[PDB]
Design brief:
PDB class: lyase
Strand order of the largest sheet of chain A: 1-2-4-5-6-3
CATH topology of chain A: Thiol Ester Dehydrase, Chain A
Chains A, B: Beta-hydroxyacyl-ACP dehydratase
Largest interface: A-B, 26 and 25 residues
CATH superfamily of chain A: Hotdog Thioesterase
Structural class of chain A: mainly beta
CATH architecture of chain A: Roll
Largest sheet of chain A: 6 strands, antiparallel
Number of helices of chain A: 1
Distance between the termini of chain A: 20 Å
CATH class of chain A: Alpha Beta
Entry title: Crystal structure of dimeric form of PfFabZ in crystal form3
Radius of gyration of chain A: 14 Å
Strand content of chain A: over 45%
Oligomer: homodimer
Number of domains of chain A: 1
Number of strands of chain A: 6
Assembly: dimeric
Keywords: fabz, hotdog fold, non-isomorphism, plasmodium, lyase
Chain lengths: 120, 124
């Protein structure tokens, strides 16, 4: 099943765990045959985490990101483990914001304080 | 030529203005031709500027990797054919801890389409 993404390539090979309106965990095996291909740029990590967050929430648009630290370089051979948490949602100012964290071998390679998304 | 960027593409067609230790303006004419996508992914706009900023750090002096980014806001959508006008500003140079901080803005037809408060670079 596939849904939004302005970015052409979905960066979530698998949603291994999801809890409606609360949290979601997924992962990505970085192959040597990735469309954006050697290291996965942290900018595409934001993306992956953005998509996951979007999976959870499910129109939506990526309105902004805050607090991003790329502590480590993702390499082909690395499996990006990701978890995003819904911080707030507003059937008002139609805005939703979640936080995301990505790991490699149980170690944090990326941190995102808050990703903001807007309706339609 | 020159530049480290872990994104295969150089999202900056050309630097139309440079003031070392201070600022830099560049253009990116979004084309239907490219890889990312049809609308331009916000994250690549972070990328497009991040590279523009990097180009400036390189002019200041030394490898600089992208370590953090804050206060990013995507106001308007960038469509193909749009001419991205970006400008990064050198915030600091606390390269005690080997770290640089630039801010950045991108405009399309004189209107702000993206804002990045702080982009952090560092070590090697």
């Amino acid at each position: 099943k596939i849904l939004p993404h302005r970015y052409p390539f979905l960066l979530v090979d698998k949603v291994i765990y999801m809890q409606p309106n609360k949290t979601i965990i997924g992962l990505k095996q970085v192959s040597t045959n990735e469309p954006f291909f050697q290291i996965m740029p942290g900018v595409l990590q934001i993306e992956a985490l953005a998509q996951l967050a979007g999976i959870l929430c499910l129109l939506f648009l990526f309105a902004g990101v805050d607090g991003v630290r790329w502590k480590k370089p993702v390499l082909p051979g690395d499996t990006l483990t990701m978890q995003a948490n819904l911080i707030s949602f507003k059937s008002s100012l139609g805005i939703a914001k979640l936080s995301g964290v990505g790991y490699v071998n149980g170690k944090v390679v990326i941190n995102i304080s808050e990703m903001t998304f807007a309706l339609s």
